[PDB]
Amino acid sequence: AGVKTFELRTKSKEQLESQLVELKQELATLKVQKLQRPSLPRIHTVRKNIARVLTVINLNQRENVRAFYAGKKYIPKDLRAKKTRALRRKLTKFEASQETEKARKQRIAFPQRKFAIKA
């Protein structure tokens, strides 16, 4: 099952880099042993361990960028919403709710009334 993610996420950047290289040399050691076994299922465990560490390294590095760009007007396009191309071209709620002062006066002056019949 390999290493466990929540331990990796409590580590710093420099610790993760040390464990990454420590796992990579161990994977290289196994591929040398594969020349003689040749069946060696532990290779599978190490390869997925390298994946987990690389994932934690990336996800930690990405949230540091998110904090750097919180509330800014312009942020990197990979940090923007990725809904669909058409939904990004669509008018925002503020833009779609924009209303001329003439139209605002009419809607306020004549709202849809509530009424009933036969009384």
Partner 1 sequence: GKGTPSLGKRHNKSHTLCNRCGRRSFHVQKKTCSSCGYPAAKMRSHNWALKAKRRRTTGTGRMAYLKHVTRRFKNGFQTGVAKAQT
Partner 2 sequence: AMKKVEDGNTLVFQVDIKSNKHQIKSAVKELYDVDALYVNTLIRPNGTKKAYIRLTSDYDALDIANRIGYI
Partner 3 sequence: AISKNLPLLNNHFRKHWQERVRVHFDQAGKKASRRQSRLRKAAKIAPRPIDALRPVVRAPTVKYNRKVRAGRGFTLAELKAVGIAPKYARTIGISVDHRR
Cβ-based nearer residue to partner 3, 77 or 113: 113
Closest among 69, 87, 89, 71 to 79, alpha carbons compared: 69
User: Binding to partner 2 by residue 96, rule CB under 8 A?
Assistant: no
Residues 27-46: b if buried by 16+ CB within 10 A, e if exposed: eeebeeeeeeeeeeeeeeeb
Residues 8-47 that bind partner 2 (CB under 8 A): 28-29, 32-33, 35
User: Binding to partner 3 by residue 81, rule CB under 8 A?
Assistant: no
Give the integer Cα–Cα distance in Å for 60 and 9.
8
Alpha-carbon distances, residue 56 vs 20, 50, 60, 85, 105 (angstroms): 11, 10, 6, 29, 55
Cβ-based nearer residue to RNA, 81 or 119: 81
Alpha-carbon distances, residue 4 vs 27, 29, 53, 56 (angstroms): 18, 22, 10, 11
Residue 71 contact among partner 2, partner 3, RNA, none, beta carbon within 5 to 8 Å by kind: none
String of contacts with partner 2 for each residue 57-86, x by CB under 8 A: ------------------------------
Cβ-based nearer residue to partner 3, 41 or 111: 111
User: Binding to partner 1 by residue 89, rule CB under 8 A?
Assistant: no
Which positions lie near partner 2, rule CB under 8 A?
28-29, 32-33, 35
